[PDB]
Design a protein around this ligand. Structure first.
Ligand SMILES: NC(=O)C1=CN([C@@H]2O[C@H](COP(=O)(O)OP(=O)(O)OC[C@H]3O[C@@H](n4cnc5c(N)ncnc54)[C@H](O)[C@@H]3O)[C@@H](O)[C@H]2O)C=CC1
Ligand SMILES: NC(=O)C1=CN([C@@H]2O[C@H](COP(=O)(O)OP(=O)(O)OC[C@H]3O[C@@H](n4cnc5c(N)ncnc54)[C@H](O)[C@@H]3O)[C@@H](O)[C@H]2O)C=CC1
Ligand SMILES: O=C(O)/C(Cc1ccccc1)=N/O
Ligand SMILES: O=C(O)/C(Cc1ccccc1)=N/O
Ligand SMILES: [Ca+2]
Ligand SMILES: [Ca+2]
Lengths: 328, 328
């Protein structure tokens, strides 16, 4: 009895194999969608490993006859209808710890790139700009701002948010956060200021950074309405989920100068391109291809944890043996 | 009696005027060299304000008949033969406080850009790269590394170095420093590790960042010899002085992969260009046009301090009244 475990949206299973070699038949599908998956896998697969590049609706889930557990190789699971998955008897789990600090470090890099304009200054030199005089330095580096005394607003004070807050303090940022699902008192433990509404957050924050999961109640959390609530010349950073931001509203804000700059590692439609979308001709923009998470150590770590979860499921009882089940 | 005060390498004196209006005749020269300066200024100027774009040798200093004080609008004064200046009875002063944290923030941005590859990832998207799969993310973000447990080596633990150390700790960096002119015990106050030699520093450091002044004994401190002392795949960051690095040795190291990446805000010959010099075809390179210092608040601050120093000189006694004389 060697049940089938399938990596849906990937082609490499090397890291997972030594953890599943003796308890599972391991295959990959390199599929961007269900249509790309073989009937055999849909029919026989007892467990599934997936990243974020594929989405599983209830319809897509129904195509799995033997599937009993899904493990997201990552923390975000907005790409899975976990409630239905659970109704179908399919446990869904994630890997929340592997890339917390990598993601927090990327977030700070982006924040610092907006405040110090390092990436744009480098892009300009590549383009040929010559900066001889001090006058020119000020002109080309225009927009660069002193960080101390500035207020950083954190939306979602979880693992990454907390990691960001602690680093941000070391730069002299006054750190605020809005997280309506957290219990009373976390702000005291970490020496932070808390606000009760998103509007308060956006109103007092010079730089807004997103670190909340994408759920039923925060799609386009940043929109034409809430953008108007944001400070004039404010910064925006997103290393969480693209669906949190209406890129139409963000684009216009950037062109209008209502928002001085934005740094995005995630987008409404990924992969991102500078030639495709509302952000096409939008200025003062930094963008990275969902790589805030990445380091060799982290990638290996999350894949090893996911396989272990898969193994706990096959060898034990669902969902009692699971360490990171998000849909009990 | 309204003595002449001249801004040598600049054209704007607006910030200085309200501080000198009643005690000095203020003029500017917008000169990249002495040859560009009018005889009247060379003859009559009693005080001089200058940035870093002009250099004053003893020969250039001798062209000043009435000059009594020079104030560097900035901290670095390697562009002035201060010893000769003093022999000629000319006090030289600087402005060491204004852009400490700006410079430290830029330094961190660069360090984070090397470790997280944010600037290169953004450049790639601009170039058209499409990153659809996880495999592609790892490939394009290859070289991105986990920061915790890494060792940051600081050369020169002064104002900026200390500011960098404190921030760096917040990312999980193990921080070392080499500063042979500092007194016993500073390492204990700030919770840092100290080494006695440059070789030790370079040998234990995954990322090396420079924060020492340019003096008689550290030109090309980083050279073919000392580069060989650097760890394999090490990072290099420089926001201090260009003359500290032999760009020939750095280039070859980058091409050979002996150095994985370098981030430079200063250069042997400024202004810098990607089309001119040894770094011309050198890879894994980030470069900014000496803007680590810049913020509107800082620029105004240092100019106001410099004028005040000029005023202290005219209205008081040299060098007893001076706050920041570096060549007593
Ligand atoms: N770009 C990348 O490579 C990576 C992105 N991420 C993303 O970052 C996000 C945060 O990850 P973690 O901190 O590990 O998750 P977490 O579960 O530890 O933290 C989420 C926090 O956001 C809060 N939150 C949820 N909805 C909210 C709303 N509408 N307003 C305010 N706060 C809200 C929750 O109370 C929770 O404390 C995730 O959504 C994940 O998708 C995570 C890892 C890597
Ligand atoms: N790129 C920019 O916009 C800016 C650059 N800078 C540069 O950064 C450098 C540091 O500035 P601060 O920290 O304010 O100066 P500082 O005088 O406060 O610190 C200099 C430190 O370097 C140490 N040092 C000198 N020679 C050394 C050597 N051979 N090896 C090891 N350590 C050595 C000294 O002991 C001293 O502690 C300056 O040289 C300045 O030119 C400063 C401000 C802005
Ligand atoms: O966005 C996520 O859920 C991530 C990032 C990730 C993880 C694995 C592969 C790609 C991106 N969490 O780690
Ligand atoms: O390099 C320096 O000495 C600086 C940076 C600077 C200052 C004024 C104008 C340009 C650069 N110190 O602040
Ligand atoms: Ca502002
Ligand atoms: Ca290394």
């Amino acid at each position: 009895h060697m049940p089938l475990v399938a990596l849906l949206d990937g082609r490499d299973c090397t890291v997972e194999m030594p953890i599943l070699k003796d308890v599972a038949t391991v295959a990959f599908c390199d599929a961007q969608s269900t249509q790309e998956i073989h009937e055999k896998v849909l029919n026989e697969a007892v467990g599934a490993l997936m990243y974020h590049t594929i989405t599983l609706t209830r319809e897509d889930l129904e195509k799995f006859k033997a599937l009993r557990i899904i493990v997201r190789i990552g923390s975000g699971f907005d790409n899975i209808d976990i409630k239905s998955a659970g109704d179908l008897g399919i446990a869904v789990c994630n890997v929340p710890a592997a890339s917390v600090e990598e993601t927090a470090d990327s977030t700070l890099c982006h924040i610092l790139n907006l405040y110090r304009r390092a990436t744009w200054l480098h892009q300009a030199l590549r383009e040929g700009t010559r900066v001889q005089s001090v006058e020119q330095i000020r002109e080309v580096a225009s927009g660069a701002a002193r960080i101390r005394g500035e207020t950083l607003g954190i939306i979602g004070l979880g693992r990454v948010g907390q990691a960001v807050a602690l680093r941000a303090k070391a730069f002299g940022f006054n750190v605020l956060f809005y997280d309506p699902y957290l219990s009373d008192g976390v702000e005291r433990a970490l020496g932070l200021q808390r606000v009760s509404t998103l509007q308060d957050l956006l109103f007092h924050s010079d730089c807004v950074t997103l670190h909340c999961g994408l759920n039923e109640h925060n799609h386009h959390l940043i929109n034409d309405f809430t953008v108007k609530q944001m400070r004039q010349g404010a910064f925006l950073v997103n290393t969480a989920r693209g669906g949190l931001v209406d890129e139409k509203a963000l684009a216009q804000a950037l062109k209008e100068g209502r928002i001085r700059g934005a740094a995005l590692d995630v987008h409404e439609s990924e992969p991102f391109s500078f030639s495709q979308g509302p952000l096409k001709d939008a200025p003062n923009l930094i963008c990275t291809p969902h790589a805030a998470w990445y380091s060799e150590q982290a990638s290996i770590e999350m894949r090893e944890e996911a396989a272990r979860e898969i193994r706990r499921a096959i060898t034990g009882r669902i969902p009692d043996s699971l360490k990171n089940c998000v849909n009990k």
